[PDB]
Design an enzyme around this catalytic site. Structure first.
Site, PDB file in Angstrom:
ATOM      1  N   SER A  15      25.536  33.769  42.124  1.00  0.00           N
ATOM      2  CA  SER A  15      26.048  32.434  42.446  1.00  0.00           C
ATOM      3  C   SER A  15      25.107  31.321  42.020  1.00  0.00           C
ATOM      4  O   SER A  15      23.890  31.482  42.077  1.00  0.00           O
ATOM      5  CB  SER A  15      26.292  32.310  43.931  1.00  0.00           C
ATOM      6  OG  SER A  15      27.415  33.073  44.315  1.00  0.00           O
ATOM      7  N   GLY A  16      25.679  30.183  41.622  1.00  0.00           N
ATOM      8  CA  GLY A  16      24.878  29.051  41.193  1.00  0.00           C
ATOM      9  C   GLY A  16      24.426  29.215  39.755  1.00  0.00           C
ATOM     10  O   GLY A  16      23.970  28.266  39.113  1.00  0.00           O
ATOM     11  N   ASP A  60      32.147  23.088  44.582  1.00  0.00           N
ATOM     12  CA  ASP A  60      30.937  23.889  44.723  1.00  0.00           C
ATOM     13  C   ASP A  60      29.953  23.543  43.612  1.00  0.00           C
ATOM     14  O   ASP A  60      29.832  24.262  42.608  1.00  0.00           O
ATOM     15  CB  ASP A  60      31.270  25.374  44.691  1.00  0.00           C
ATOM     16  CG  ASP A  60      30.117  26.239  45.185  1.00  0.00           C
ATOM     17  OD1 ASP A  60      29.252  25.721  45.930  1.00  0.00           O
ATOM     18  OD2 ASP A  60      30.087  27.438  44.845  1.00  0.00           O
ATOM     19  N   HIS A 107      27.140  25.686  47.645  1.00  0.00           N
ATOM     20  CA  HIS A 107      27.088  26.698  48.694  1.00  0.00           C
ATOM     21  C   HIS A 107      25.753  27.428  48.764  1.00  0.00           C
ATOM     22  O   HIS A 107      25.456  28.098  49.753  1.00  0.00           O
ATOM     23  CB  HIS A 107      28.250  27.741  48.525  1.00  0.00           C
ATOM     24  CG  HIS A 107      27.955  28.836  47.543  1.00  0.00           C
ATOM     25  ND1 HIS A 107      28.548  28.902  46.300  1.00  0.00           N
ATOM     26  CD2 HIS A 107      27.134  29.909  47.623  1.00  0.00           C
ATOM     27  CE1 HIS A 107      28.106  29.969  45.658  1.00  0.00           C
ATOM     28  NE2 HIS A 107      27.247  30.598  46.439  1.00  0.00           N
TER      29      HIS A 107
HETATM   30  O1  LIG Z   1      31.451  35.338  47.365  1.00  0.00           O
HETATM   31  C1  LIG Z   1      32.161  35.609  48.331  1.00  0.00           C
HETATM   32  N1  LIG Z   1      31.968  36.713  49.092  1.00  0.00           N
HETATM   33  C2  LIG Z   1      30.685  37.442  49.051  1.00  0.00           C
HETATM   34  C3  LIG Z   1      30.482  38.031  50.467  1.00  0.00           C
HETATM   35  C4  LIG Z   1      31.565  39.078  50.747  1.00  0.00           C
HETATM   36  C5  LIG Z   1      31.555  40.193  49.700  1.00  0.00           C
HETATM   37  C6  LIG Z   1      31.729  39.637  48.287  1.00  0.00           C
HETATM   38  C7  LIG Z   1      30.630  38.580  47.998  1.00  0.00           C
HETATM   39  N2  LIG Z   1      30.797  38.124  46.623  1.00  0.00           N
HETATM   40  C8  LIG Z   1      29.927  37.304  45.988  1.00  0.00           C
HETATM   41  O2  LIG Z   1      28.867  36.927  46.498  1.00  0.00           O
HETATM   42  C9  LIG Z   1      30.384  36.898  44.640  1.00  0.00           C
HETATM   43  C10 LIG Z   1      30.080  35.536  44.156  1.00  0.00           C
HETATM   44  C11 LIG Z   1      30.568  35.123  42.842  1.00  0.00           C
HETATM   45  C12 LIG Z   1      31.338  36.056  42.033  1.00  0.00           C
HETATM   46  C13 LIG Z   1      31.949  35.941  40.710  1.00  0.00           C
HETATM   47 CL1  LIG Z   1      32.064  34.617  39.561  1.00  0.00          CL
HETATM   48  C14 LIG Z   1      32.544  37.197  40.510  1.00  0.00           C
HETATM   49  N3  LIG Z   1      32.371  38.064  41.547  1.00  0.00           N
HETATM   50  C15 LIG Z   1      31.645  37.430  42.517  1.00  0.00           C
HETATM   51  C16 LIG Z   1      31.164  37.848  43.828  1.00  0.00           C
HETATM   52  C17 LIG Z   1      33.259  34.707  48.691  1.00  0.00           C
HETATM   53  C18 LIG Z   1      32.883  33.337  49.043  1.00  0.00           C
HETATM   54  C19 LIG Z   1      33.939  32.380  49.337  1.00  0.00           C
HETATM   55  C20 LIG Z   1      35.357  32.799  49.280  1.00  0.00           C
HETATM   56  N4  LIG Z   1      36.331  31.847  49.687  1.00  0.00           N
HETATM   57  C21 LIG Z   1      37.122  31.236  48.715  1.00  0.00           C
HETATM   58  C22 LIG Z   1      37.915  30.110  49.148  1.00  0.00           C
HETATM   59  C23 LIG Z   1      37.957  29.639  50.513  1.00  0.00           C
HETATM   60  C24 LIG Z   1      37.175  30.275  51.527  1.00  0.00           C
HETATM   61  C25 LIG Z   1      36.295  31.404  51.084  1.00  0.00           C
HETATM   62  O3  LIG Z   1      35.528  31.906  51.910  1.00  0.00           O
HETATM   63  C26 LIG Z   1      35.718  34.194  48.910  1.00  0.00           C
HETATM   64  C27 LIG Z   1      34.653  35.150  48.616  1.00  0.00           C
END
Ligand SMILES: O=C(N[C@H]1CCCC[C@H]1NC(=O)c1ccc2c(Cl)c[nH]c2c1)c1ccc(-n2ccccc2=O)cc1
Lengths: 52, 234
Positions: free
Chosen positions: B185-186, B88, B42
């Site tokens: 992430s990553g 991912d 991603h």
């Molecule tokens: O990361 C998302 N949202 C992000 C943007 C909205 C605000 C929060 C942000 N958080 C992060 O960047 C984040 C990244 C890693 C970790 C780890 Cl380890 C622990 N805490 C975090 C937080 C996010 C992306 C994909 C899904 N999702 C899952 C399945 C299917 C469809 C879908 O969309 C849900 C949530």
């Protein structure tokens, strides 16, 4: 319990071949003569924090 | 990283950072060898053209031990979809080889069975990165690491508003205010075994950061070891 008992005394990977412990290592490591310890081959072996 | 501690000198040598055209980090990575970086698929969407920086701990000033590397080949898992965020994972083949030194070293890749039986069954794992230190804030300029408990498989599915596939696993705290965050992430999730650290997960996603009743979701590296092996040869 072989590998179930303290990783069968292996430094790294532990397998069971013919009902006996078999130790192995990741790349950059050589299995020591004792067939249990992993000996790094270079100054920066994988998985080791660089504390010089 | 919310909470946790900053990575002291040489404590997280396998951390990699993806930087865009503006030299800013947007995602993390894990050094696998002098030629390969492991990261989240991603992340490949978050930027058009990016490079990889290794050996840095402070984004502000050019410390002297860091190095930037250009990506030669991007290997994205073909089953990935933003719809599910399953699979991912991606591997990066760098143009020039990483020279190892202080703060620059690869993390070990474990063997599937052993890893599942010995690493995944451990109480904790370590996650690290330059992500936000608070849910609302800027990207940290300091590299941080945090010990996150492995989370019960069943328990975590109940807590999720999304399907937790078998290519994913949970780690973190239900209440305690410590968790990965945006930007991490990553990044690497590594498990310590007898003073040796093996790569076990990739920072995938989370519903916010450190929220009560929620957990961090990582890509299970043991589920792709074979894929990783083929990717490092091709
Ligand atoms: O990361 C998302 N949202 C992000 C943007 C909205 C605000 C929060 C942000 N958080 C992060 O960047 C984040 C990244 C890693 C970790 C780890 Cl380890 C622990 N805490 C975090 C937080 C996010 C992306 C994909 C899904 N999702 C899952 C399945 C299917 C469809 C879908 O969309 C849900 C949530």
């Amino acid at each position: 319990k072989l590998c179930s008992l303290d990783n069968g005394d292996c430094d790294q990977f532990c397998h069971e071949e013919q009902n006996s412990v078999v130790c192995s290592c990741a790349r950059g490591y050589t299995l020591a003569d004792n067939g249990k310890a992993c000996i790094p081959t270079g100054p920066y072996p994988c998985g080791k924090q660089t504390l010089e | 990283i919310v909470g946790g501690q900053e990575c002291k000198d040489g404590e997280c040598p396998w951390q990699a950072l993806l930087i865009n055209e503006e030299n800013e980090g947007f995602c993390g990575g894990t050094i696998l060898s002098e030629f390969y970086i492991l990261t989240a698929a991603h992340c490949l969407y978050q930027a058009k053209r990016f490079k990889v920086r290794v050996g840095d701990r402070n984004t502000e000033q050019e410390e002297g031990g860091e190095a930037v590397h250009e990506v030669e080949v991007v290997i994205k898992h073909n089953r990935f979809t933003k719809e599910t965020y399953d699979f991912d994972i991606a591997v990066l083949r760098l143009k020039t080889p990483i020279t190892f030194r202080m703060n620059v070293a690869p993390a070990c890749l474990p063997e599937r069975d052993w890893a599942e039986s010995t690493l995944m069954t451990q109480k904790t794992g370590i996650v690290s990165g330059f992500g936000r230190t608070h849910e609302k804030g800027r990207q940290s300029t300091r590299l941080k690491m945090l010990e996150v408990p492995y989370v019960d498989r069943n328990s975590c599915k109940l807590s999720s508003s999304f399907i937790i596939t078998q290519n994913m696993f949970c780690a973190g705290y239900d209440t305690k205010q410590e968790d990965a965050c945006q930007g991490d992430s990553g990044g690497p999730h590594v498990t310590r075994f007898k003073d040796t650290y093996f790569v076990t997960g990739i920072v995938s996603w989370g519903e916010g950061c450190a929220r009560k009743g929620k957990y961090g979701i990582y890509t299970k590296v043991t589920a792709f070891l074979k894929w990783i092996d083929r990717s490092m040869k091709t």
